[PDB]
Scaffold this active site. Structure first.
Site, PDB file in Angstrom:
ATOM      1  N   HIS A   1       0.816  -1.226   0.000  1.00 26.10           N
ATOM      2  CA  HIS A   1       0.000   0.000   0.000  1.00 26.10           C
ATOM      3  C   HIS A   1       0.846   1.272   0.000  1.00 26.10           C
ATOM      4  O   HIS A   1       0.482   2.309   0.577  1.00 26.10           O
ATOM      5  CB  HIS A   1      -1.026  -0.001   1.170  1.00 26.10           C
TER       6      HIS A   1
ATOM      7  N   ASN B   1     -10.065  -3.328   2.768  1.00 30.00           N
ATOM      8  CA  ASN B   1      -9.936  -3.322   1.319  1.00 30.00           C
ATOM      9  C   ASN B   1     -11.233  -3.040   0.540  1.00 30.00           C
ATOM     10  O   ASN B   1     -12.319  -2.976   1.135  1.00 30.00           O
ATOM     11  CB  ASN B   1      -9.322  -4.634   0.869  1.00 30.00           C
TER      12      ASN B   1
END
Ligand code: HDD
Ligand code: HDD
Ligand code: HDD
Ligand SMILES: *[C@@H]1O[C@H](CO)[C@@H](O[C@@H]2O[C@H](CO)[C@@H](O)[C@H](O)[C@H]2NC(C)=O)[C@H](O)[C@H]1NC(C)=O
Ligand SMILES: *[C@@H]1O[C@H](CO)[C@@H](O[C@@H]2O[C@H](CO)[C@@H](O)[C@H](O)[C@H]2NC(C)=O)[C@H](O)[C@H]1NC(C)=O
Ligand SMILES: *[C@@H]1O[C@H](CO)[C@@H](O[C@@H]2O[C@H](CO)[C@@H](O)[C@H](O)[C@H]2NC(C)=O)[C@H](O)[C@H]1NC(C)=O
Ligand SMILES: *[C@@H]1O[C@H](CO)[C@@H](O[C@@H]2O[C@H](CO)[C@@H](O)[C@H](O)[C@H]2NC(C)=O)[C@H](O)[C@H]1NC(C)=O
Ligand SMILES: *[C@@H]1O[C@H](CO)[C@@H](O[C@@H]2O[C@H](CO)[C@@H](O)[C@H](O)[C@H]2NC(C)=O)[C@H](O)[C@H]1NC(C)=O
Ligand SMILES: *[C@@H]1O[C@H](CO)[C@@H](O[C@@H]2O[C@H](CO)[C@@H](O)[C@H](O)[C@H]2NC(C)=O)[C@H](O)[C@H]1NC(C)=O
Ligand SMILES: *[C@@H]1O[C@H](CO)[C@@H](O[C@@H]2O[C@H](CO)[C@@H](O)[C@H](O)[C@H]2NC(C)=O)[C@H](O)[C@H]1NC(C)=O
Ligand SMILES: *[C@@H]1O[C@H](CO)[C@@H](O[C@@H]2O[C@H](CO)[C@@H](O)[C@H](O)[C@H]2NC(C)=O)[C@H](O)[C@H]1NC(C)=O
Lengths: 669, 314, 669
Positions: free
Chosen positions: B56, B129
């Site tokens: 990320h 997510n």
């Protein structure tokens, strides 16, 4: 090197272990703190990353060799240069400047070309760029330039790009940047590969002989693969279709035994000639035109080995202009001076500790003797228990090295200072506009158009009206024409001609599109557009392949789906993947029509793109006369090829590949 | 917040100073070690970077607020949820997974949706997510998944992409990944914006009441802007033409007073129902189909403030 | 190892350089930023320090080896224990607990004894203390213990000492500490050397056999040099006269070929016996008395090699209980459990990076095979380019290791869990007082006095009245007598006897003063007090020397000034430097002022030695009379008076073995 082709999994201390399931309190229970297998693994992962380089974060490296052409004792004491045929191992990293470490290779930017020579007298680094001059005249300004050029600090936009307000605000307020700016706005800002660009030391350095005398020098690494660049509209698409293009290119060239090469050259001039060329040689915004100082070829640099672990080798390599050897010295270039401090300090950031020279890639190939001790990550066990000077207890070892003993480095003794301590810019640094003009004058007329176009592109993305005006003001000081043509795209009046720095002087060797055909076409990529319907189509392909591959080209046969003889599908294919494109006759049906195996119009899109970007395009076969009129590609046009004889098609096409770009397809003002 | 709209340049300890020319031993001489102006400024620059997030790395954030729709004492003791119309400040960061900093927003990937609630009983983070299930069943496997999915360790190729041998070697050897793989290969891999995607906690958590009793829960952040996605061939071009697409989008939506919104919802089920749906609720490769447990709207999440300094905040 | 006995000074990248004068702009001018020789050197220096260890910051280490006495396959799968005469290299570091890295060795503290076995199945660490039990029952409490024990957070006072309010506030509120506290207040708190103390693993561990069965174990490292300890008043002086005493001692013992040794032993009991001794074996505040489980000698540990670089070896060694091998497993001891997390985490603080196991001192002696990558300071270049599991592209290597393949570590399969997840203390852990009492009962009456005295000393430095009372309350629960005698020094009434935990049980082997004479006197230090006036004095000395040195003792002849035969001056000398003291007859004048030492020093040394319980003696004719002048009783135990040199030694050497003469210390009434 650590081998893991066989064996059982161990911890870092060699205890055999497993790493696939956590230790749990019952088959459906919670994980246990005492699971050391889990924690050692995840701790390592959690800590894998290090800070990216402050600038040049995006790059790639390779191993190679430098070979000297002679004994250059007459010009320098430098040992790696002291004998004909002497071989020094090297490592080189190329990079862009502004982008973070995952940004596209084919952004428009200045490029890094950083070379380490592992000499028998210490590591020696030449940390340079693909462009021979820099934006600024004083290192103390580096954070200003870089802040303005990188993404805006409020939202971190845009990535890897000078096309925003702050960059041009800076450029327009700091006119010293015009010269580099012009270079970056040319094709030099978007090279075809690392192998098709040059390297420059930028600063003037000194060669020093054992007798203590010094000449002033400039390093040039000239590419033996020739100069080539992309066109903007193609580079944009490439950035998306293949962010890794330049690194894949370098990797591939090396795997296939086509290691790229450069002649390592210098310009040599006298101390007395510091100001003899109409500019100060301590000014890193200026070149010595080849007309006034010819290049001397010193030796050959060749890259022929890819690294084994990117992180351990490419990511960890830490260059320093501070890595200097006996025979070279610095000059009072205020840019170079500050760099000396920066590259030593930054590695503390990157390595997190002072012992970064102990990493395999940073180690020298000769013994180390000094009194440095301790520090986090100390990997040596020092035997000398009296690490101070002067000592008697270790018999006054290690001994001091200097001019006359132990082959010590030494400052050029001629160097002198005088006057006041000042924070003032030398008046000799004040002409920011002549040389950019010199540069622009030396480009072909299409090259000029492309440069104007790059500027049109960027300036039109600058939101602020006031900044656009100040940009036009500076541009005008270099060339009224350029100002006018740029101003036309952003709907402003160019200011009135100002001719203080206008002139018509040209210099050789700065032009890409005017540097004639490539000296080699080995490794260039040819796409062959075929089909799985006509049995004839794949047979044509296979025959072109044998003939083209014979000449060192890299061939891709494209079709709807994969099979023997087909390297990739229309789905994954794109014009940016090729240096030239060939349609085999039997595929005519596809160019005239939809399939669920690729997007609509793809096969034609590839071809039309290739043509519009100036690439050698061609149809090979009988009905070739007619596939072009359907494609809207002129049969008689330069670099468009139409033939039935396979042997004569190749022969003609290969000439196009060498010309590389067909400049007649681009409109001028 | 530090204001620099007026004043003279100072060192970090407030001594007024300049920063445009090095201190030199004569107008054409070498720079002096004693030039503290130079060294303090370059030292700072040399040290600006910090390691990017292990996964990320590519992402963007915004400030907003969460409002509770009710007093949810009947299901949880959680204070930010204990009153109708109760406001908690939030900060959210969206991201892709595999790409480094500077990779393109519109690569094909799973996406992160990470929310901090600065509650009056401590900071509470839901780290989720845009896809409700994950590739693997045990955290100890995370580095295997991530190594395989990230670029090849010999040449760091390819950036931000599962399109290479190692990734598929892993997916094909570790079948637990099929579910997330299918999600990532859909349009969920390439959303039109952060605003046009949902958020999921993925794991089952527990709601706990003051009396000590617990229900099993799944978090869902449903987008009030609706679901939309790019097409591949478009996403590829966009990665080149604008690597910053998603972050530009969110920044703009907020500047123009169109802050994106999500309904923060949960599925609630009983401890006894752990294995009642034909799969284990401790398995993060599984969803509870909406047909078997409807969603309850708990409150409203809205992003309406951009950060002032990206580095310092996001 | 890096050799610097010859050569010229180089930079860390091997470029020959000097390092004695800065590069300056003129002979009387400012230093230049471009002076890379200066900056590389000073950067290294500026970064030499690393954080000290959070606890055990003050310590010292040595290399050695461990030898197995047998094939212990009947009790454990542990490879380093699988063959008679099997040698494994070791490294051991001993330490105190509370003090920072420059604090005295001879502060009153618990002591660290940490051992690394570089086994052929991975590194195995036993991280223990010189005291078999610990202050607390749960790792989560470790920062509380340590905060209270270390200096006060407002002023950072006092260094290396429990003699302040917070420590005793904690001890009095956390009664689990009684047991360790009693040990630390004994002579165990102030050992004569690292060599004269034992090592303990403290926690119960498990031995595990290839068939999966487990026994519960306790590690004991028994000293082959015997047990010995200083007296408080002596320790205090020693802290000032020689902060380095213990490390000096260990260094010297090893240089002279007298490497210290320990029998590595265990107590082995059954899983069923977890609660069979009247306490829970998961409780690290308890011992299994030798009466109920005898010790088994497993092998011999010997230290015989000093490090080359202290920093690189001793400072950088990083122990972990997580460094476990096949054949050992953990138990549910809530203190042990937490330690597993801490020792892996803390090395990030100390090393500044995740690759600490790659430091030479931390590396294993076997190959490493795993998928850990990258991280700052990565020193390997990994060949396996598919570092994931499961893979096919590296043929599923490295292979998972477990019980039945690859000799993997495995958790004892017998271990089970049940009940709720709880943050609650087991009721079985509730008796904090019996074992301290057992301990106290097992000491000689003088040892008891010393312990009371240590407690009187500290408690009297506790400023707060309330805390003193709470201390007395806790002490009273162990022994009313102890409370009474301690209370007497701080002027408070001991509370009324509480007999819930009183008893008269004794255990063997915990007493120092009652453990009989030393098994060897080699390396003990003897000071000979002589003079340069009488020619006879130095002749007496020289003869004593030959005789004493023959028996492995270390001899120092003290005089007013140095010369042949004299090792040190009265100025630099002190009783704390000697295990026994001898005045030669010819020096009587000195014991009855000089500008060469402080007033009264020669007599001060002797009187001190006597008062601290050391073997003292006069050797010669008028020996009869030098003692009455000194006020030392001629007939007193361990006082020696003889004319025959051969007889004097023979007598004196018996006193050195007794080591301490306990009849010179007053007891309570
Ligand atoms: C005063 C600061 C400063 C100035 C004026 C310059 N640089 Fe720089 N440069 C750095 C401060 C820096 C740095 C922050 O110290 C970097 C980042 C990471 C590193 O190793 O050094 C760096 C990296 C760096 C790299 C990356 C090397 C690699 O691949 O690791 C190259 C090729 C250059 N520089 C080239 C230049 C050129 C041609 C310059 C103009 C003469 C230049 N730099 C001016
Ligand atoms: C065992 C390790 C591990 C496992 C199994 C996971 N993660 Fe993770 N994740 C990390 C270890 C990690 C990390 C390495 O700890 C990161 C990187 C930087 C950070 O702050 O945490 C992270 C970052 C991270 C972020 C970025 C937050 C931000 O923008 O700063 C999100 C949204 C997630 N994770 C979400 C997940 C989800 C929904 C998972 C599956 C249910 C998941 N992670 C599994
Ligand atoms: C969870 C916290 C914690 C707890 C309850 C303990 N320790 Fe510890 N110990 C550490 C956390 C720690 C540490 C903070 O992680 C240290 C400091 C430096 C290091 O590497 O580990 C350490 C250092 C350390 C050292 C020094 C090692 C060396 O010389 O480098 C020894 C000998 C011990 N410990 C032994 C013990 C014993 C016998 C304990 C009682 C059973 C104990 N520790 C409890
Ligand atoms: C320094 O030394 C080299 C010695 O080779 C000189 O270069 C040669 O110059 C001659 C003509 O003078 C050429 O025919 C050779 O081919 C050159 N050799 C190479 C390898 O270039 C060089 O000219 C000398 N330079 C100076 C300034 O003395
Ligand atoms: C070229 O440089 C090399 C390296 O400095 C020289 O070789 C070394 O010279 C020193 C002292 O003169 C010796 O003690 C080393 O053993 C040498 N190394 C080797 C490999 O021979 C060499 O003399 C230089 N050559 C010329 C022509 O100047
Ligand atoms: C344009 O070119 C001319 C010719 O090369 C330059 O004039 C020379 O400048 C140098 C450096 O000052 C003089 O010492 C030479 O003797 C000059 N030569 C001749 C033949 O005139 C001129 O400087 C250039 N102009 C610009 C603006 O770059
Ligand atoms: C928990 O309490 C909430 C708080 O009101 C309940 O939700 C309400 O349900 C009724 C109809 O059943 C509606 O009139 C309200 O508008 C609801 N409010 C909201 C915000 O949903 C909820 O049903 C209770 N849930 C449980 C499981 O007890
Ligand atoms: C919702 O949560 C808030 C915060 O915990 C509660 O208000 C607090 O209540 C405590 C104890 O009763 C007070 O001592 C605090 O001072 C309050 N804090 C604040 C910031 O006001 C409130 O009671 C909760 N509401 C319900 C319905 O349970
Ligand atoms: C495990 O095996 C060892 C190997 O000999 C045993 O050790 C011996 O034990 C016998 C008594 O049973 C003694 O006579 C020997 O002197 C011991 N030798 C040593 C070196 O200790 C050990 O007893 C066995 N233990 C068990 C539990 O079976
Ligand atoms: C004692 O120690 C080592 C433990 O590894 C053993 O030697 C290994 O034995 C296996 C055979 O099963 C081999 O595959 C290893 O390669 C050997 N390693 C070494 C370093 O020699 C030995 O088997 C053990 N002895 C006993 C009696 O159990
Ligand atoms: C004092 O010693 C006695 C004698 O061993 C201990 O009493 C025994 O304890 C063991 C372990 O609990 C039991 O199995 C026996 O039943 C007891 N035996 C006898 C003969 O009484 C007692 O536990 C000790 N007390 C303390 C406080 O240590």
């Amino acid at each position: 090197e650590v081998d893991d082709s066989t064996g059982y999994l161990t911890s870092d201390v060699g205890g055999p272990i497993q790493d696939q399931t956590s230790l749990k309190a019952g088959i459906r229970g919670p994980t246990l703190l005492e699971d050391f297998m889990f924690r050692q693994k995840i701790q390592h992962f959690d800590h894998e990353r290090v800070p990216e380089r402050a600038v040049h974060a995006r790059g790639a490296g390779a191993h190679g060799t430098f070979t000297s052409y002679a004994d250059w004792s007459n010009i320098t004491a430098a040992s790696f240069l002291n004998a004909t045929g002497k071989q020094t191992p090297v490592f080189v990293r190329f990079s862009t400047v502004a982008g973070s470490r995952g940004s596209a290779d084919t952004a428009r930017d200045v490029h890094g070309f950083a070379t380490r020579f592992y000499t028998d007298e210490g590591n020696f680094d030449i940390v340079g760029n693909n462009i021979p001059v820099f934006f600024i005249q004083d290192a103390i300004q580096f954070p200003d330039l870089i802040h303005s050029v990188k993404p805006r600090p409020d939202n971190e936009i845009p990535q890897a790009a000078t096309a925003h307000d702050s960059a041009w605000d800076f450029f327009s307020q700091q006119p010293s940047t015009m010269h580099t700016l012009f270079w970056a706005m040319s094709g030099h800002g978007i090279p075809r590969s690392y192998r098709h660009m040059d390297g420059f030391g930028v600063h003037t350095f000194r060669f020093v002989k054992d007798d203590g005398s010094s000449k002033l020098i400039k390093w040039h690494f000239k590419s033996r693969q020739g100069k080539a660049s992309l066109v903007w509209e193609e580079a944009q698409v490439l950035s998306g279709k293949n962010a890794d293009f330049h690194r894949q290119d370098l990797w591939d060239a090396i795997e296939s035994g086509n290691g790229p090469e450069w002649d390592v050259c210098v310009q040599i001039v006298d101390e007395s000639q510091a100001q003899a060329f109409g500019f100060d040689l301590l000014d890193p915004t200026k070149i010595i035109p080849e007309e006034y100082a010819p290049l001397t070829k010193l030796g050959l640099l060749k890259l022929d080995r890819n690294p084994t672990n990117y992180f351990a080798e490419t990511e960890q390599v830490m260059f320093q202009p501070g890595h200097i050897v006996r025979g070279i010295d610095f000059t009072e270039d205020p840019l170079l001076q500050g760099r000396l401090f920066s590259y030593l300090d930054t590695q503390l950031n990157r390595n997190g500790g002072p012992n970064f020279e102990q990493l395999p890639i940073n180690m020298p190939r000769v013994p180390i003797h000094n009194n440095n001790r301790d520090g986090a990550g100390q990997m040596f066990i020092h035997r000398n228990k009296y690490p101070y000077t002067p000592n008697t207890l270790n018999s006054g070892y290690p001994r001091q090295a200097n001019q006359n003993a132990g082959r010590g480095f030494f400052t050029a003794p001629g160097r002198t200072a005088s006057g006041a301590l000042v924070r003032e810019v030398s008046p000799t640094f004040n002409d920011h506009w002549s040389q950019p003009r010199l540069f622009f004058n030396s480009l072909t007329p299409v090259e000029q158009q492309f440069l104007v176009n790059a500027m049109r592109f960027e300036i039109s993305l600058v939101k602020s009206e006031e900044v656009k005006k100040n940009v036009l003001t500076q541009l005008n000081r270099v060339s009224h024409d350029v100002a006018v043509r740029v101003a036309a795209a952003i709907g402003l009046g160019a200011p009135d001609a100002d001719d203080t720095y206008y002139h018509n002087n040209k210099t050789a060797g700065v032009s890409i599109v005017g540097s004639g055909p490539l000296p080699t076409i080995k490794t260039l990529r040819v796409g062959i557009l075929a089909t799985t319907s006509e049995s004839s189509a794949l047979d044509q392909a296979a025959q072109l392949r044998t003939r083209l591959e014979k000449d060192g080209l890299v061939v891709t046969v494209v079709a709807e789906t994969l099979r023997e003889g087909v390297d990739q599908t229309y789905s994954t294919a794109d014009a940016t993947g090729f240096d030239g494109v060939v349609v085999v006759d039997g595929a005519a049906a596809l160019f005239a029509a939809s399939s669920p195996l690729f997007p609509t119009g793809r096969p034609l899109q590839i071809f039309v793109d290739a043509y519009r970007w100036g690439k050698p395009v061609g149809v090979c076969g009988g009905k070739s006369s007619e596939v072009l009129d359907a494609a809207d590609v002129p049969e008689d046009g330069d670099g468009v090829y139409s033939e039935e004889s396979v042997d004569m098609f190749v022969e003609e096409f290969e000439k196009g590949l060498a010309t590389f770009r067909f400049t007649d397809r681009f409109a001028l003002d």
